[PDB]
């Protein structure tokens, strides 16, 4: 989302972001991370930030 | 040549060893769906499932009987057990015929496709309908397409997408009946 | 440079090429139908890169016509 008032509704997807980037993360798999909405590059950031652009 | 045997049933078990267990395993989109391709029946005789579908409408899912679809090699038409066929499709117009009764929608280009099943699943993005285009304004700007012919092979594409909609969108405001 | 239709040649992604259009069919709609094609046809977000990890530059989009038809 972009305004932050939802109750961890972008934090849970958050959660199932790494859940699924570790799944497929099989082989040493190229990721590039990407975020629609402001509520999401202060999130993901703190989980997974060198791979993220 | 498949060594990566992926879907949604074998994501689930996979995912329940590397994940946490505290989470229940993300959705899918085939989830949402019960109307496969390679689901053997789905045509019961002469109408068949068409489900014309639009980014902002779902403008028909119901069953007709034949369908012209405006190919990029011309017009077709599509019965009940046809072919199966990925059809890209140019701005033309799309007749939904399901007996006596036919419905013309213009459409701007967009894929058709048809399933081993027999389900049509026309993918357009813009579907108005032949009653609400004005037949004016549309040679005020095909003209003007005809006009601007610069160098520049990205505007050159856009213009032909230009003269090319028009021109199949007056020859289908004439000779209505 | 590449091989295929002629949008794709020319450098233009299927997207754009179908969204122009897209864009081109609702300017000649009636206009009882022509102006609430005009919502589906605006464009308003932003975008910033991120190569460091905090950092990025910008770019905002806030047309309401269409998808542009020059070169991005």
């Given at each position: 989302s972009d305004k932050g008032l939802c109750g961890g509704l972008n934090s849970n997807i958050t959660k199932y972001t790494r859940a699924t980037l570790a799944t497929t993360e099989s082989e040493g798999k190229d990721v590039v991370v990407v975020s629609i909405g402001d509520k999401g590059r202060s999130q993901l950031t703190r989980i997974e930030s060198q791979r993220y652009q | 040549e498949a060594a990566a045997p992926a879907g949604p049933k074998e994501f689930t078990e996979v995912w329940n060893k590397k994940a946490p267990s505290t989470l229940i395993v993300p959705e899918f989109p085939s989830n949402y769906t019960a109307v496969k391709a390679v689901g053997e029946g789905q045509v019961h005789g002469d109408a068949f499932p068409v489900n014309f579908?639009?980014?902002?409408?779902?403008?028909?899912?119901?069953?007709?009987?034949?369908?012209?679809?405006?190919?990029?090699?011309g017009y077709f038409g599509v019965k009940a057990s046809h072919v199966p066929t990925i059809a890209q499709l140019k701005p033309g117009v799309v007749e939904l015929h399901s007996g006596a009764e036919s419905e013309k929608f213009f459409v701007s280009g967009g894929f058709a496709f048809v399933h081993p099943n027999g389900v049509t699943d026309i993918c357009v993005l813009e579907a108005a309908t032949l009653d609400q285009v004005d037949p004016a304004a549309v040679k005020s700007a095909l003209a003007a397409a005809s006009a601007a012919q610069?160098?520049?092979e990205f505007e050159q594409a856009a213009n032909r997408a230009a003269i090319e909609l028009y021109s199949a969108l007056e020859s289908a405001v004439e000779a209505k009946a | 440079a590449p091989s295929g239709p002629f949008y794709r040649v020319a450098g233009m992604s299927y997207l754009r090429y179908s969204?122009?259009?897209?864009?081109?069919?609702?300017?000649?709609?009636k206009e009882p139908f022509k102006a609430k094609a005009q919502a589906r046809q605006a464009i308003h977000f932003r975008q910033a890169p991120y190569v460091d990890g905090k950092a990025g530059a910008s770019k905002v989009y806030e047309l309401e016509n269409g998808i542009p038809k020059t070169a991005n």
């Open positions: - | 579908y639009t980014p902002h409408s779902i403008l028909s899912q119901a069953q007709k009987d034949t369908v012209v679809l405006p190919g990029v090699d610069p160098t520049d | 969204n122009i259009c897209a864009d081109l069919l609702r300017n000649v709609l």
